[PDB]
PDB file of C-alpha atoms and ligand atoms in Angstrom:
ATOM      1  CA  UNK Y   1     -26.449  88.646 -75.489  1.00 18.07           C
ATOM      2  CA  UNK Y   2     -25.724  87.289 -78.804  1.00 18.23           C
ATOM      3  CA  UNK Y   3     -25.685  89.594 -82.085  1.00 15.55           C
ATOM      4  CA  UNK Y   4     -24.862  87.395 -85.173  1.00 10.95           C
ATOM      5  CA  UNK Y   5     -27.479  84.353 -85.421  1.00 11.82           C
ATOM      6  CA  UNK Y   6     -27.451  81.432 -88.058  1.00 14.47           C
ATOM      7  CA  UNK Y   7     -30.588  79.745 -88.448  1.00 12.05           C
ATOM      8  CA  UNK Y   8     -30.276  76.270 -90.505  1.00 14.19           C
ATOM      9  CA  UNK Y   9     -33.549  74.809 -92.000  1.00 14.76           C
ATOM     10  CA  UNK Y  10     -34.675  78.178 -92.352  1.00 14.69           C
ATOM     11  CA  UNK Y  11     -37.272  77.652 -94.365  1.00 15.21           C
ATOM     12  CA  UNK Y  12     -39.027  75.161 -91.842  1.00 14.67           C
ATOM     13  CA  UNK Y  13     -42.393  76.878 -90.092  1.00 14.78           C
ATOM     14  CA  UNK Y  14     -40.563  77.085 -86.499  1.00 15.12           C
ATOM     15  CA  UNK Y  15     -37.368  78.362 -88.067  1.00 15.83           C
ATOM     16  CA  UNK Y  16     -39.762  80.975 -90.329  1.00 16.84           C
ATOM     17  CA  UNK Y  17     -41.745  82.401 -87.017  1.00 16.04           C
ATOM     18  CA  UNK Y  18     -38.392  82.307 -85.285  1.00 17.44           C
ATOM     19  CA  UNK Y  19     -36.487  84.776 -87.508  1.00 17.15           C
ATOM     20  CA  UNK Y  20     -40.023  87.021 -87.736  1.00 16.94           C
ATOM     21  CA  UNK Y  21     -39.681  87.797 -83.653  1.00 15.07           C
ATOM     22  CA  UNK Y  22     -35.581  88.030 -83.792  1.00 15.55           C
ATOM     23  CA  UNK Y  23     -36.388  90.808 -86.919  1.00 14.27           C
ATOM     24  CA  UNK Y  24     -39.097  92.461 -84.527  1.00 15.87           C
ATOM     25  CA  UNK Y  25     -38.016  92.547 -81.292  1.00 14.97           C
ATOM     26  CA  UNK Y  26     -34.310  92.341 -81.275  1.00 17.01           C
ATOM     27  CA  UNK Y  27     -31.713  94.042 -83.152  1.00 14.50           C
ATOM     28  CA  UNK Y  28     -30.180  90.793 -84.198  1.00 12.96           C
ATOM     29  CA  UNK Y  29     -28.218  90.295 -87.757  1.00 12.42           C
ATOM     30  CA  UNK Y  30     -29.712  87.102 -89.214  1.00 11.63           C
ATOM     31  CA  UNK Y  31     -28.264  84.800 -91.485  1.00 11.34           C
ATOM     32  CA  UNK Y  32     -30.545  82.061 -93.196  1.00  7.98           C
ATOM     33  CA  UNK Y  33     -29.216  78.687 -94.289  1.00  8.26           C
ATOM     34  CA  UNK Y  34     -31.438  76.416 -96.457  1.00  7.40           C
ATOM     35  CA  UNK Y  35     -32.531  74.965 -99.686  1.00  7.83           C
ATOM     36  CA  UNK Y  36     -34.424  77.763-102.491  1.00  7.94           C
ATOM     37  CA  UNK Y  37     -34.964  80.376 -99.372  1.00  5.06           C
ATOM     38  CA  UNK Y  38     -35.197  82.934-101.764  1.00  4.27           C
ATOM     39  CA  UNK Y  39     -38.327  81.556-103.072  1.00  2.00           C
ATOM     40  CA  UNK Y  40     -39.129  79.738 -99.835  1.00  2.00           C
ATOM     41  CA  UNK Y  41     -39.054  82.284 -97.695  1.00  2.00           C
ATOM     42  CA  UNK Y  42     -41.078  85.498 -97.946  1.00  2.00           C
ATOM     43  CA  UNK Y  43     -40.437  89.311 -98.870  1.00  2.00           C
ATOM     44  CA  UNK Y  44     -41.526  90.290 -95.271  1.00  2.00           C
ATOM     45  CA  UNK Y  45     -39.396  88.422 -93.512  1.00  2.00           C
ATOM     46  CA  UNK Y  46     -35.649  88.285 -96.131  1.00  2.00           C
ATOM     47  CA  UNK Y  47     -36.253  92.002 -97.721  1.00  2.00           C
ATOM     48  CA  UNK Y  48     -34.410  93.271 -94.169  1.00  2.00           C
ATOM     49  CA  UNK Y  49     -31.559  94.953 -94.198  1.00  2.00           C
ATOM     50  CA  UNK Y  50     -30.958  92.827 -90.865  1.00  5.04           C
ATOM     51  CA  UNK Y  51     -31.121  89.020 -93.102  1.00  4.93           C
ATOM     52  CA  UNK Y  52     -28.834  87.401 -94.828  1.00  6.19           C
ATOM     53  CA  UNK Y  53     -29.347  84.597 -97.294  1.00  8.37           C
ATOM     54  CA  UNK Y  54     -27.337  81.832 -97.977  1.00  6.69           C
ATOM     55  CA  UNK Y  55     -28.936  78.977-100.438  1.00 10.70           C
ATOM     56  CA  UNK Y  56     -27.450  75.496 -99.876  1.00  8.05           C
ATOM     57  CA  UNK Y  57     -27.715  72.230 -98.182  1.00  6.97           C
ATOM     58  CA  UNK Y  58     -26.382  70.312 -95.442  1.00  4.93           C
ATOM     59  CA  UNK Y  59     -24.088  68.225 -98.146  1.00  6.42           C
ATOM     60  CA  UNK Y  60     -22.449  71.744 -99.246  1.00  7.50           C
ATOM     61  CA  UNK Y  61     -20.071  72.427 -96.760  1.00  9.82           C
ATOM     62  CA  UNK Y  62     -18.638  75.417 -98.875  1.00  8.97           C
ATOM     63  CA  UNK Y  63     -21.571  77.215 -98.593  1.00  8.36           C
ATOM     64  CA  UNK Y  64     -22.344  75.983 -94.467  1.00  9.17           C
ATOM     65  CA  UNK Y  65     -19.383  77.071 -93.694  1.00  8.41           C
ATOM     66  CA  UNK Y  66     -19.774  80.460 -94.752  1.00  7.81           C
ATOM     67  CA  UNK Y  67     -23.577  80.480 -93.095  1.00  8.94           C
ATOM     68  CA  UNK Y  68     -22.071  79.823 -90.185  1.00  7.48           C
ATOM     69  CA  UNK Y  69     -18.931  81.810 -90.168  1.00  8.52           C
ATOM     70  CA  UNK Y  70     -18.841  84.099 -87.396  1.00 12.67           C
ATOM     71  CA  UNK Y  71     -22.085  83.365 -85.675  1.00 13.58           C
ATOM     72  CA  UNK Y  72     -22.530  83.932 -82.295  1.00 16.07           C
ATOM     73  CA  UNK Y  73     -25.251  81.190 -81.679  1.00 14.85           C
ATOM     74  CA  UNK Y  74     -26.758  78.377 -84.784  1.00 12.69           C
ATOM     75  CA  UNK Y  75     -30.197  77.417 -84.428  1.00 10.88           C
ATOM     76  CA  UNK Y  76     -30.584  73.561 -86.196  1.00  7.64           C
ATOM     77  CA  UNK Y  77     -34.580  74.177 -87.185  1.00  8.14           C
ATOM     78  CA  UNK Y  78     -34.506  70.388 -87.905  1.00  7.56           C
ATOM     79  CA  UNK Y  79     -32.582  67.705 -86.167  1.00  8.08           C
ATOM     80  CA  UNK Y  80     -33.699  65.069 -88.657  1.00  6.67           C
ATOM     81  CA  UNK Y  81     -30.632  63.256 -90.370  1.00 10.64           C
ATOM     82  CA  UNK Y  82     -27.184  61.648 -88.671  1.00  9.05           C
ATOM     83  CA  UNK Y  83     -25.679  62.711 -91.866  1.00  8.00           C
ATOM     84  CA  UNK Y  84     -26.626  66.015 -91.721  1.00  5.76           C
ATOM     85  CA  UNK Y  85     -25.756  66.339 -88.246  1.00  8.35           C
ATOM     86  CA  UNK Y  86     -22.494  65.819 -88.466  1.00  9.73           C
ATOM     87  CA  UNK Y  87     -22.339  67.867 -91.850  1.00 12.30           C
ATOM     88  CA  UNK Y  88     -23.215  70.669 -89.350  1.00 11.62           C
ATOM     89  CA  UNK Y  89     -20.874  69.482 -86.195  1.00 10.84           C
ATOM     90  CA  UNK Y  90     -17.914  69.567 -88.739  1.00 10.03           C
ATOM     91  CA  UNK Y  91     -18.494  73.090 -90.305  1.00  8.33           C
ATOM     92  CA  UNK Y  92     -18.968  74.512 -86.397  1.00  8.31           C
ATOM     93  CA  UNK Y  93     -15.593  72.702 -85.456  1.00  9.85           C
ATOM     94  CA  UNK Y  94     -14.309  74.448 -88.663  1.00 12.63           C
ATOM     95  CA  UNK Y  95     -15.621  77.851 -87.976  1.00 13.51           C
ATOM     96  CA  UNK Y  96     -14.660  77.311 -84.075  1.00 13.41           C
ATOM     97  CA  UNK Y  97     -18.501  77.980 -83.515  1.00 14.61           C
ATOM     98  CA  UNK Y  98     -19.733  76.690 -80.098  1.00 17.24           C
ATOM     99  CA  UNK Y  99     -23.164  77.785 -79.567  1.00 20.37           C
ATOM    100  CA  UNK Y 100     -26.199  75.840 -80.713  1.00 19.94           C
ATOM    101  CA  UNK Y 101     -29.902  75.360 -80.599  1.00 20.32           C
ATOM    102  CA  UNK Y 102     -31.569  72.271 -81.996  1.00 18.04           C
ATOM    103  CA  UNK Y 103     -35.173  71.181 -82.143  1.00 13.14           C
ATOM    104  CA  UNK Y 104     -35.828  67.598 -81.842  1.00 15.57           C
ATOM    105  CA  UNK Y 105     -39.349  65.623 -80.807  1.00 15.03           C
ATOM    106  CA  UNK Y 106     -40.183  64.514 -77.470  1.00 16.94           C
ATOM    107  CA  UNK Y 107     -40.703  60.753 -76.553  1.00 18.34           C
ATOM    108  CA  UNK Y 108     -37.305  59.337 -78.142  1.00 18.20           C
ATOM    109  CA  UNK Y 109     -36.238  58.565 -74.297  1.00 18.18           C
ATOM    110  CA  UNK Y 110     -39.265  56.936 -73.640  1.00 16.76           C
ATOM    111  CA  UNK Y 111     -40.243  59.945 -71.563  1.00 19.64           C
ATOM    112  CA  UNK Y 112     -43.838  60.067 -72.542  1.00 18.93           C
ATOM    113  CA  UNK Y 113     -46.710  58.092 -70.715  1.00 19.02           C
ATOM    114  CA  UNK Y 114     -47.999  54.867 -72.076  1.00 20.46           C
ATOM    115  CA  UNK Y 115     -50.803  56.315 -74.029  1.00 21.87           C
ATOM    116  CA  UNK Y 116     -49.376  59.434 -75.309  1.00 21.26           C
ATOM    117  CA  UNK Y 117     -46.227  57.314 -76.132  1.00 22.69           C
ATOM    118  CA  UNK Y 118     -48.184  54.646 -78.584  1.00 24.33           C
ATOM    119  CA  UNK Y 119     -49.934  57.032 -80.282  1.00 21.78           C
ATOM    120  CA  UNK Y 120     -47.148  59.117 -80.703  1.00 22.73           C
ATOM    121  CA  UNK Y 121     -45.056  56.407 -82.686  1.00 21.86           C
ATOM    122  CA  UNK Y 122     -48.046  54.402 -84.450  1.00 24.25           C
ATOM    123  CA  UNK Y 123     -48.278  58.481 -86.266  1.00 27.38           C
ATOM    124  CA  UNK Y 124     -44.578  58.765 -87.384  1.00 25.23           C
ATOM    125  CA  UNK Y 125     -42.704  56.741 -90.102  1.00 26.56           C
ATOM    126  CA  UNK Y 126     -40.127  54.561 -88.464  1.00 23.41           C
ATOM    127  CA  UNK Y 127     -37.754  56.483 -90.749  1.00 23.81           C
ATOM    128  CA  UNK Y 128     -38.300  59.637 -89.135  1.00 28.40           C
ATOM    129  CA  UNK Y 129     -37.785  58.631 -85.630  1.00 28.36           C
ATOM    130  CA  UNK Y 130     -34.521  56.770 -86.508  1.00 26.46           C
ATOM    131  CA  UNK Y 131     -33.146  59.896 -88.613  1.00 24.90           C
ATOM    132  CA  UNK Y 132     -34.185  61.898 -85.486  1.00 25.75           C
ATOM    133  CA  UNK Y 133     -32.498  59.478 -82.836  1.00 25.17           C
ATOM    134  CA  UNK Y 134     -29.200  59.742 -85.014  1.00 24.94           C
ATOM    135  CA  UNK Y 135     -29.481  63.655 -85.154  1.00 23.45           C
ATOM    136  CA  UNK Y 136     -29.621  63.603 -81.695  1.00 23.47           C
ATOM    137  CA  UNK Y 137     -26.320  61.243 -81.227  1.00 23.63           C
ATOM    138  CA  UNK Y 138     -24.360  63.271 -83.119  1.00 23.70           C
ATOM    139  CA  UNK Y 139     -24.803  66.287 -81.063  1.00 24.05           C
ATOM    140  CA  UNK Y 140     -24.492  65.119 -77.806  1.00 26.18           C
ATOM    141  CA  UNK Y 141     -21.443  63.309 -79.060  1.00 27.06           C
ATOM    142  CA  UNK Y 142     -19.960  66.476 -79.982  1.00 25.03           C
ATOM    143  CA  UNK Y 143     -18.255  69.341 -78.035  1.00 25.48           C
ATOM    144  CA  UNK Y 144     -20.693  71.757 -78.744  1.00 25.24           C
ATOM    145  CA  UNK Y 145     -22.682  74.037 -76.170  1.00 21.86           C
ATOM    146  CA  UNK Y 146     -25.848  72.416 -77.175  1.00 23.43           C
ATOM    147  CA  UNK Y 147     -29.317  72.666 -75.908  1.00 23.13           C
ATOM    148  CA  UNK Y 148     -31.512  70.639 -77.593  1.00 24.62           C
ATOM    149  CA  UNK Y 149     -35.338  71.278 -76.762  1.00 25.46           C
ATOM    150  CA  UNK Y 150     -37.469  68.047 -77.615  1.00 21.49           C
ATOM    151  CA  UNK Y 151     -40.801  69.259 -79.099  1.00 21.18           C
ATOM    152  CA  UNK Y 152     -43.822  67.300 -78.282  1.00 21.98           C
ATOM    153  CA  UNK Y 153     -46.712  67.928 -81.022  1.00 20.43           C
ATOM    154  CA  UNK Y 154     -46.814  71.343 -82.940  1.00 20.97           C
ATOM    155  CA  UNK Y 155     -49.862  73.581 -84.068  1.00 26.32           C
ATOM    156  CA  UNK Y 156     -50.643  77.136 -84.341  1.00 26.40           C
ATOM    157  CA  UNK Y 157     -52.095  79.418 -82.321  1.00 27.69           C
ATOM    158  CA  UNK Y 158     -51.046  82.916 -81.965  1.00 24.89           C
ATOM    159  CA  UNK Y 159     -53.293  82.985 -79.004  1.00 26.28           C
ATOM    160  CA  UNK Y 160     -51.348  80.121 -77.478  1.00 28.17           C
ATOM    161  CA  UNK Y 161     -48.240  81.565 -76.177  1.00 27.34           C
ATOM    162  CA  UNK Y 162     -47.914  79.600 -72.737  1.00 24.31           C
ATOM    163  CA  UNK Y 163     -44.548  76.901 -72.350  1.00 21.60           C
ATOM    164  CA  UNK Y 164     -43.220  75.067 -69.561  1.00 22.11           C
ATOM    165  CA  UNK Y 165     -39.794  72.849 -69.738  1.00 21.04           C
ATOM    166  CA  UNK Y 166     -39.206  69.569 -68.901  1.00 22.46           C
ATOM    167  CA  UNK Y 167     -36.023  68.617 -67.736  1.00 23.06           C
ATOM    168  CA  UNK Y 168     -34.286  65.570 -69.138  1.00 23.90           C
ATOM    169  CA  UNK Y 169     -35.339  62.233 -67.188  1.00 26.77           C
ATOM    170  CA  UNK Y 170     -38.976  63.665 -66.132  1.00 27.82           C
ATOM    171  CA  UNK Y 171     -42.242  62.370 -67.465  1.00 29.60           C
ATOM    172  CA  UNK Y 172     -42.834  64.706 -70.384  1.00 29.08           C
ATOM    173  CA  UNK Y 173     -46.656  64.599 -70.129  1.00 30.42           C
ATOM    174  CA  UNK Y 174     -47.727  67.227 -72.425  1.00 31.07           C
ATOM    175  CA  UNK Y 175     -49.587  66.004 -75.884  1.00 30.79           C
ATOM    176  CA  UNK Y 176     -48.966  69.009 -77.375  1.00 30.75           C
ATOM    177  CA  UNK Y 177     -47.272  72.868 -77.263  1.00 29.70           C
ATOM    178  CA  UNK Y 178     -47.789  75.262 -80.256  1.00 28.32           C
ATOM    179  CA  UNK Y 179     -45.431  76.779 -82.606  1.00 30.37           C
ATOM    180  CA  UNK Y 180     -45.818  80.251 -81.492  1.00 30.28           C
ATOM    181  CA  UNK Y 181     -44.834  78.903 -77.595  1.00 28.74           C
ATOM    182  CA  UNK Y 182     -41.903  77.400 -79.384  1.00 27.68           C
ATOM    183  CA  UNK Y 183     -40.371  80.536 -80.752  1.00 30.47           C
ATOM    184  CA  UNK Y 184     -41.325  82.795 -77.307  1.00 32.18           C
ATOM    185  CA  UNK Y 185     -39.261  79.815 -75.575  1.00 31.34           C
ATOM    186  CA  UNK Y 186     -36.441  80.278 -78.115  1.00 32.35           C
ATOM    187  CA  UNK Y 187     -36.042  83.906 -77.521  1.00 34.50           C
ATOM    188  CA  UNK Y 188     -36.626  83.355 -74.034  1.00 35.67           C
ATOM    189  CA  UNK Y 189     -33.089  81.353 -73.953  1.00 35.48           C
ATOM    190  CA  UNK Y 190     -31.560  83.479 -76.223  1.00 35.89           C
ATOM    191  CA  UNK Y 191     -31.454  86.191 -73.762  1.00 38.59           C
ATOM    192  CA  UNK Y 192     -30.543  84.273 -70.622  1.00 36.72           C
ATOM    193  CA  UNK Y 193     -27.857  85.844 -68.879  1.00 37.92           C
ATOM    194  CA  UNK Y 194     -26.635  82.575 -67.058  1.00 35.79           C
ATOM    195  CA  UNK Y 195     -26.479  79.837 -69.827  1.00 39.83           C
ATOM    196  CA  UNK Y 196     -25.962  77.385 -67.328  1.00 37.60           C
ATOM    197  CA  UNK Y 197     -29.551  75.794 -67.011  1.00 38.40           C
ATOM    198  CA  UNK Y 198     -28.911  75.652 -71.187  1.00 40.41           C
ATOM    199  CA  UNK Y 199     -25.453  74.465 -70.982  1.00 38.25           C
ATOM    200  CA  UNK Y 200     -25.175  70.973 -72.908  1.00 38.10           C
ATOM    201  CA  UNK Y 201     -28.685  69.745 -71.877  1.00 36.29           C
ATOM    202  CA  UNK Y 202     -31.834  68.562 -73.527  1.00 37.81           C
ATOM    203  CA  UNK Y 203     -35.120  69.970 -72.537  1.00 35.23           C
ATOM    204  CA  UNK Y 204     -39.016  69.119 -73.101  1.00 35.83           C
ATOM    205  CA  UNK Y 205     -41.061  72.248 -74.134  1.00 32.57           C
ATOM    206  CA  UNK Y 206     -44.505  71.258 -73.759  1.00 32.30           C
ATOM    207  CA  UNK Y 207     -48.051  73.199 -73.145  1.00 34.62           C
ATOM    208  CA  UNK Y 208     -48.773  73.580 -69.468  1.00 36.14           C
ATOM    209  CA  UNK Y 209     -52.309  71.578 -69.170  1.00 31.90           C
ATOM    210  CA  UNK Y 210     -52.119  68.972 -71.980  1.00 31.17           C
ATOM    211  CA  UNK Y 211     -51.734  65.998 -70.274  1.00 39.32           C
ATOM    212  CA  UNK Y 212     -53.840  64.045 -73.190  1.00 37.40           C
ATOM    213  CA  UNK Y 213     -53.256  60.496 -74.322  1.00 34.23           C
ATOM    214  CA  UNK Y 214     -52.906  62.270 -77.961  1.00 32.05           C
ATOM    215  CA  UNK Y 215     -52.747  66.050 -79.478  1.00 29.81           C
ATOM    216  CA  UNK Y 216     -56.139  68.448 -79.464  1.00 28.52           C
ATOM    217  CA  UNK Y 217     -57.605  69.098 -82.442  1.00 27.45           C
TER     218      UNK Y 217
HETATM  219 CL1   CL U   1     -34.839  74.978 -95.039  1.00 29.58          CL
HETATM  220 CL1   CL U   2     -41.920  73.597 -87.376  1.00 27.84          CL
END
């Protein structure tokens, strides 16, 4: 049971439909960390007397470490940067914050098949795999009671609320798992009485029945 949350990358469309279901179905106090969220971020979902908002980046440690302060659990909407990363270990060290949630994309493990796997990295800049590689080193480098869930491709459908998870090591054979999936997944470890299963590991969340050599349309 956790009760003070800290989302960083707030703004991002996981993060967004994230702190929409913790405002609805919990009783959670929210704290959002991120660039402009006051004009990011809309009425609906910051006009609550349940939100917070803190505007700053990852290279204002000031201002992260007073997003963080006191949270009970930090969701990372965006494992993206080494930099960053450790911006973020360093103000949880300060803060003596131990909980976190980070979203990161599946394949960097060479976990996908061989079709899935090619097309995967022949549609992402070299950049972006490398920042997200790094992102990932930092954390499990730190001391942190991480679970990092490894996305494979995103789209929307509220209809689409089915996830399964792929333990770290398995063939992660799922092209794609939608947003909405994501977040039920999210919450779904949020409120797991035995953190174990979650304790310092890195987990696929993929849609059951999309074992396709590249994302549905
Ligand atoms: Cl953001
Ligand atoms: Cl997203």
């Amino acid at each position: 049971m956790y009760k003070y949350i800290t989302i960083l990358g707030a703004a991002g469309q996981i993060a967004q439909k994230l702190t929409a279901t913790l405002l609805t179905y919990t009783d959670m106090h929210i704290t959002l960390y991120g660039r402009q969220l006051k004009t990011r971020i809309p009425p609906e979902i910051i006009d609550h007397e349940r939100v917070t908002v803190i505007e700053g980046s990852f290279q204002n440690p000031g201002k992260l470490e007073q997003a963080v302060t006191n949270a009970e659990v930090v969701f990372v909407g965006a494992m993206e940067s080494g930099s960053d990363m450790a911006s973020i270990v360093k103000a949880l060290s300060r803060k003596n914050i131990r909980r976190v949630i980070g979203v990161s994309m599946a394949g960097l493990s060479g976990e996908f098949p061989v079709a899935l796997e090619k097309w995967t990295f022949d549609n992402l800049p070299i950049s972006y795999v490398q920042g997200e590689r790094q992102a990932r080193n930092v954390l499990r480098e730190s001391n942190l009671n991480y679970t990092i869930l490894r996305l494979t491709w995103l789209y929307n459908d509220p209809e689409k609320t089915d996830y399964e998870l792929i333990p770290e090591g398995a063939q992660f054979n799922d092209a794609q798992v939608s947003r909405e999936a994501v977040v039920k997944a999210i919450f779904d470890i949020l409120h797991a009485a035995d953190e174990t299963p979650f304790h310092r590991t890195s987990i696929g969340v993929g849609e059951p029945g999309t074992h396709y050599d590249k994302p549905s349309f």
